[PDB]
Structure formats: C-alpha cells, structure tokens
Amino acid sequence: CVQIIGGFFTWTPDGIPTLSNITIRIPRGQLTMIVGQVGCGKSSLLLATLGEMQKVSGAVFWGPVAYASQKPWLLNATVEENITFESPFNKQRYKMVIEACSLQPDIDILPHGDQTQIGERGINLSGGQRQRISVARALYQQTNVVFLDDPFSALDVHLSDHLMQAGILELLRDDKRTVVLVTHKLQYLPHADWIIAMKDGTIQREGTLKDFQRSE
Ligand SMILES: Nc1ncnc2c1ncn2[C@@H]1O[C@H](COP(=O)(O)OP(=O)(O)OP(O)(O)=S)[C@@H](O)[C@H]1O
Numbered sequence: 001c002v003q004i005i006g007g008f009f010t011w012t013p014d015g016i017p018t019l020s021n022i023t024i025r026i027p028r029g030q031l032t033m034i035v036g037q038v039g040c041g042k043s044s045l046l047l048a049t050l051g052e053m054q055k056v057s058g059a060v061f062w063g064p065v066a067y068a069s070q071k072p073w074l075l076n077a078t079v080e081e082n083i084t085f086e087s088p089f090n091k092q093r094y095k096m097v098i099e100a101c102s103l104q105p106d107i108d109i110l111p112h113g114d115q116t117q118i119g120e121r122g123i124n125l126s127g128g129q130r131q132r133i134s135v136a137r138a139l140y141q142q143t144n145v146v147f148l149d150d151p152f153s154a155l156d157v158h159l160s161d162h163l164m165q166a167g168i169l170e171l172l173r174d175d176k177r178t179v180v181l182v183t184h185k186l187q188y189l190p191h192a193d194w195i196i197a198m199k200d201g202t203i204q205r206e207g208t209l210k211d212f213q214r215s216e
Contacts, residue, residue: 036198
C-alpha cells in the first residue's frame with residue numbers, strides 16, 4: 001500500500017506550505033477517489049505520493065508507477081508509439097486498450113489510418129484526443145499504481161461513462177491495480193473504496209463511503 005504520515009511541503013525551498021498534515025493509506029486493489037474544490041491540493045497531493053515533491057517533515061512509503069497528468073503531453077511520433085510508450089507491442093492487449101478508450105474510430109478518422117505522425121505537441125489533434133491518448137498510455141503499461149489527474153475534463157458524458165466502465169471498472173479493476181483518480185463527479189463515488197476530501201491543502205475527511213456518510 002501507499003502510506004503517508006504527516007504531509008508537509010511546498011513549491012519553494014522556503015515559504016508558506018501548501019501541504020500540511022496529510023496522512024493517507026492507499027491499499028492495493030482499490031479505486032481511490034480524490035475530490036475537493038478548485039485549489040485544495042489534489043494534484044499537489046497526487047505528485048506528493050509520486051515522490052515528485054520531497055516533503056519537509058513527513059513519511060511516505062509505497063517503485064515504477066504509471067501517471068497521466070492533467071495537461072496531456074505527447075511525443076513527436078506516431079499514435080501507436082505514444083500508446084505503447086517503449087513497450088513490446090501486443091495484439092490483444094493493444095487492441096483491448098484501443099477499444100476500451102474510445103479511440104479506434106477517431107484514429108481511423110485521421111488522414112493516415114494509424115501510425116499517423118502526431119504533430120509537434122499535437123497541432124493536428126484536439127484536446128479530447130490528446131487526453132484519451134494519455135489515458136491510453138497510462139493504461140497500456142504493465143505496472144501496479146496508476147494515477148489519473150482529471151481525465152474526464154475534455155470528454156463527453158457518454159465517453160466518460162464508457163471509459164470508466166470498460167477501462168476503469170472492468171480493465172483496471174480486472175488486474176487488481178491501485179487506481180487513484182482525481183475527478184469531481186457523482187457516478188464514481190459509489191464505485192470507489194476510499195474518498196478523500198481536500199480543502200485548503202488539508203484532508204478534512206478520510207475513509208470509505210459509509211465512513212463518510214456517517215460523519216459530519
Ligand atoms: N508546478 C507548480 N509550480 C508552482 N506552483 C504550483 C504548481 N502546481 C500547483 N501549484 C500551486 O498549488 C496550488 C494548488 O494547486 P492544485 O493542487 O493543482 O489545485 P487543485 O484544485 O487541488 O487541483 P486542480 O486544479 O484540478 S490541477 C495553486 O494555487 C498553485 O499556485
């Protein structure tokens with residue numbers, strides 16, 4: 001599991017801390033949902049568990065980890081190269097991810113069927129396509145922990161439903177992966193195991209759905 005006791009850090013060598021008093025356990029085989037307002041330290045905490053920000057005074061333990069950032073980035077390469085991401089190409093695995101990410105029709109819509117040269121930063125692509133490709137790259141890798149920082153921001157309602165059902169609750173949950181998602185919706189809270197309520201860079205409530213509905 002991913003354990004954190006006493007989160008304390010900031011985006012400066014010295015200054016007022018935006019991470020303060022964070023203690024979270026993320027057990028294996030769990031869909032951990034993080035929710036909060038705009039500016040509650042959701043992404044900051046997501047990077048804190050990744051080892052990206054060395055905390056000042058605190059302990060954090062959990063290793064290679066897949067991650068899909070809020071802003072999608074690509075490579076000046078093909079789409080298959082983006083999704084495989086230096087991984088041995090598979091027939092059933094790659095096609096399963098392609099179908100489970102609602103990308104095959106949009107990929108066939110490109111001027112080249114596949115192996116299309118994605119432009120610099122993705123000029124010949126839109127935001128939804130880039131975010132879908134990023135989630136596909138995060139899903140295709142054979143790892144344990146998978147962080148997804150708001151992958152439903154540039155997607156439709158049907159696209160989000162299909163992605164969470166086929167990929168999250170039936171493909172990530174299939175292999176029993178530690179999936180930590182940061183989004184703000186309601187169709188995902190009953191599907192999760194641990195809800196994390198963030199406010200002003202601090203965890204206000206922590207526990208399960210029944211442990212949250214039975215508290216203030
Ligand atoms: N890379 C960075 N460098 C400097 N400051 C940052 C960086 N990322 C975040 N911050 C600061 O951290 C504060 C909170 O950022 P976030 O945790 O990302 O907000 P959030 O609402 O919890 O999550 P979002 O908005 O869905 S990414 C912001 O006011 C930023 O100024």
